[PDB]
Paper text:
Among the few candidates, the alcohol dehydrogenase from Thauera aromatica (ThaADH) stands out with a high activity for the reduction of the cyclic α‐diketone 1,2‐cyclohexanedione to the corresponding α‐hydroxy ketone. The results obtained confirm the previously observed preference of ThaADH for cyclic carbonyl compounds over aromatic and linear aliphatic compounds. This preference is in line with the physiological function of the enzyme, i. e. the oxidation of the cyclic 6‐hydroxycyclohex‐1‐ene‐1‐carboxyl‐CoA within the benzoyl‐CoA metabolism. The overall structural fold of ThaADH was consistent with those of many other MDR−ADHs, i. e. contains the typical C‐terminal coenzyme binding domain and N‐terminal catalytic domain. ThaADH shares with many ADHs of the MDR family the presence of two zinc atoms per monomer.
In this context, we determined the X‐ray crystallographic structure of the wild type (WT) ThaADH in complex with NADH, refined to a resolution of 2.60 Å, as well as of the double mutant K319A/K320A without cofactor, refined to 1.80 Å. In order to shed further light on structural features, the crystal structure of ThaADH was solved in two forms: First, the WT enzyme in complex with NADH, which had 3 molecules in the asymmetric unit (asu), comprising one‐and‐a‐half dimers, and was refined to a resolution of 2.60 Å. The quality of the model was good in monomers A and B but electron density was poorer for monomer C leading to some unmodelled side chains and higher B factors for this molecule. Analysis of the wild‐type structure using PISA supports the experimental data in suggesting a dimer as the majority oligomeric species in solution. Analysis using PISA suggested that the dimer interface of ThaADH has a salt bridge more than in CPCR2 (PDB 4 C4O) as a less stable related ADH. Residues coordinating the catalytic zinc in ThaADH are C42, H65, D156 and E66, but superposing ThaADH and CPCR2 structure suggests that the catalytic zinc of ThaADH is in a resting state as already described for CPCR2. For this reason, molecular docking of substrate molecules into the active site of ThaADH was omitted in this study, and 1,2‐cyclohexanedione was placed manually in the active site. To approximate a productive substrate binding, the maximum distance between the C4 atom of the nicotinamide ring of NADH and the carbonyl carbon of the carbonyl function (<3.2 Å) as well as the distance between the terminal carbonyl oxygen of substrate and the side chain of T44 as proton donor (<3 Å) were taken into account. Thus 1,2‐cyclohexanedione was placed in the active site of ThaADH with 3.0 Å and 2.7 Å distance between the atoms mentioned above, respectively. However, due to the manual placement of the substrate molecule without considering the catalytic zinc, the following models should be treated with caution.
Numbering used by the authors:
A (entry chain B), B (entry chain A): 3 to 354
């Protein structure tokens, strides 16, 4: 009957169950009663690789949040009782960058489980700006609980922004390199947008898995090299009457190998969507961009305003969550983090 | 009294004066009586560096053509007597690529002085599709001869496409790296679009020159290093109340050094316009594109449909040709090529 969180006090140290009181809410704030919260490589980063959080410790992690607004500041009453997905990163909505369509670079953006207390908790206080309403009627009809669509935040929306930006359209070849986590939904969403998707990875189990979920062709990056990789996608395109131009290539590995591979796949009018982050440098013919009249598009998370469309893909069964999602009790946060670090998990963990 | 061309028979061999007959014209064809034709590094490439032309030798080079329609096929009568700029490269206008706004990668694009006989000639036969009409009243009022606007093709239009694509708008910092040829017009057009333009080069004469023609700041890349170069543009932006985000960086050097420098200048929301071509590979943190939500845009020449706007910049004196342009008699084609190879020219050569 008291709200509680599971907080990181220190990298590698045990998570601490800490009860708390919700205070006065500012005018634009709401309390969401967490249904579920996803476990991300970003979260494992903070905890196992000592990546600095913006908020000082102790801090409840978790940015992949669904739940219900149970409490609201003065200008947020309209949200009470509505089931929501919380945006993983929330722009101001009011500054010249936000208002000119550059929300992804708001100097005042807030990420639960980094900037503020996160969603590994019964309850989490968040701004009401960009909350994504969930139709529970449609949720039920898709055979899903509110906790399941928690991972729509970041895991679905991030690749959704990448694909929208890239302008995937029917007849396209799409290539996604690294087809775990973000990448897997990159394949599913590219496919929903009309592309014939080539999936590339080092793990033949994720390749096998994506065969059933929108990957019309799969290639192991350990087996097939650069020169052959181009020929094999050219082959796929020719054999299926698909575009030899305007390839939509999503780099979702976050490794220099992946980036080098993806850049090598550029052709006339191609879009390379850079989604994965590495500090590794890469050797590339930058001028190929001019030679092919191609573009490389970075993507920093996703504007909230696209969350409802990403959700509609799930609700209208145009993609699958359920096969990539496993609910766990929040009190297992310790065992789950350990399991996910040791790559012993195949589905994305949701804590309840 | 016979039409003639100056043809490349063989790389490095003398140019040959060859007279010719214009036959019956197909329905969409016109003869333009050349007023002037620009001499480009592309032309020096074909002649001095043995770059393959698509049309077999012997071939009249020259793709930077202005002149007058003196003769027209049956469906092109309306063009007779009209002063024109010939597009350096003419897409089909009928293919899925041309019809979906990807004309720059049409596979059936025709370039005078490469695919067909060029403009180092009294006369050149070209399609009527994409011809840019020249207002002679406005031409006169800008203090220009028809021969002067020959270099609007490629030299102006190429950077014009790069700037339009990059979405330069008032409040922007623009950086152009390599401020000769294409680069110089990149500075002039960025500036006309409302940016405060930083010019970067290794030649202090072109820097001095661009100070007078839209470069609000100049930096010698031999004197100022990478780290300091960023600080100095940050300084320019802070001191002038300019955007510290969404920088429009145009790489116009066609050298790995320039590319490495330009990529290093990326910031939140930045556009890197890749205009220069080198075969050199470069080492870059590709993920900076995701971290800054930035984009790299290649540019292969320019859609004809934008030639009128490029010309309007010249006619309305919003940019300067005259200070960068020198007419020569076509019969000097030999002496001029030699002079331009030996870097002995400061203005762009037009042959008459
Ligand atoms: N752009 C954003 O806003 C954003 C948000 C979340 C994730 N990311 C980044 O995306 C990257 C991956 O995200 P994730 O959580 O899905 O990771 P993940 O570990 O779940 O998936 C990465 C996949 O890449 C595969 N892989 C590794 N090396 C490869 C190679 N050379 N070729 C092909 N596949 C290869 C792995 O086997 C794995 O399936 C990270 O760098 C992460 O930080 C960025
Ligand atoms: N994208 C297209 O469609 C298109 C069309 C025309 C030209 N180009 C390319 O544009 C490039 C330049 O053509 P141009 O006629 O303008 O060449 P240019 O020789 O007239 O100009 C190049 C400029 O780069 C400067 N420079 C050289 N090294 C530099 C460095 N490290 N840092 C900064 N500046 C440096 C030079 O001093 C010079 O001013 C070439 O690579 C050419 O092939 C492409
Ligand atoms: Zn996440
Ligand atoms: Zn904002
Ligand atoms: Zn040219
Ligand atoms: Zn065409």
């Amino acid at each position: 009957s008291n709200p509680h969180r599971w907080m990181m006090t220190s990298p590698g140290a045990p998570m601490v169950r800490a009860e708390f009181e919700i205070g006065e809410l500012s005018a634009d704030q709401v309390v969401v009663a967490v249904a579920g919260c996803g476990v991300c490589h970003t979260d494992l980063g903070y905890y196992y690789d000592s990546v600095r959080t913006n908020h000082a410790l102790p801090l409840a992690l978790g940015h992949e949040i669904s739940g219900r607004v149970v409490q609201a500041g003065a200008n947020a009453a309209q949200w009470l009782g509505r089931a929501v997905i919380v945006p993983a990163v929330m722009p101001c909505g009011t500054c010249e960058l936000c208002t000119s369509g550059h929300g992804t670079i708001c100097r005042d953006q807030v990420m639960p489980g980094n900037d503020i207390q996160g969603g590994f908790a019964s309850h989490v206080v968040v701004p009401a700006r960009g909350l994504c309403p969930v139709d529970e009627a449609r949720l039920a009809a898709a055979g899903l609980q509110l906790a399941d669509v928690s991972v729509v935040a970041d895991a679905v929306t991030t690749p959704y922004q990448a694909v929208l930006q890239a302008g995937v359209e029917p007849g396209d070849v799409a290539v996604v390199i690294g087809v775990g986590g973000v990448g897997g939904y990159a394949v599913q969403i590219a496919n929903a947008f009309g592309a014939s998707v080539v999936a590339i990875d080092v793990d033949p189990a994720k390749l096998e898995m994506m065969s059933k979920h929108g990957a019309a062709l799969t290639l192991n990056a350990r087996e097939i090299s650069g020169r052959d990789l181009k020929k094999a996608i050219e082959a796929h395109a020719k054999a299926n009457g698909l575009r030899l131009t305007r390839w939509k290539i999503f780099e979702c590995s976050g490794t220099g190998a992946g980036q080098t591979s993806a850049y090598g796949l550029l052709t006339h009018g191609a879009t390379l969507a850079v989604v994965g982050f590495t500090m590794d440098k890469v050797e590339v013919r930058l001028s190929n961009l001019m030679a092919f009249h191609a573009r490389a598009l970075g993507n920093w998370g996703c504007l909230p305003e696209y969350y409802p469309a990403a959700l509609d893909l799930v609700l209208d069964k145009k993609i699958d969550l359920a096969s990539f999602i496993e609910r766990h009790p929040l009190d297992q946060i310790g065992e789950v983090f350990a399991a996910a670090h040791a790559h012993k998990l195949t589905r994305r963990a949701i804590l309840t």
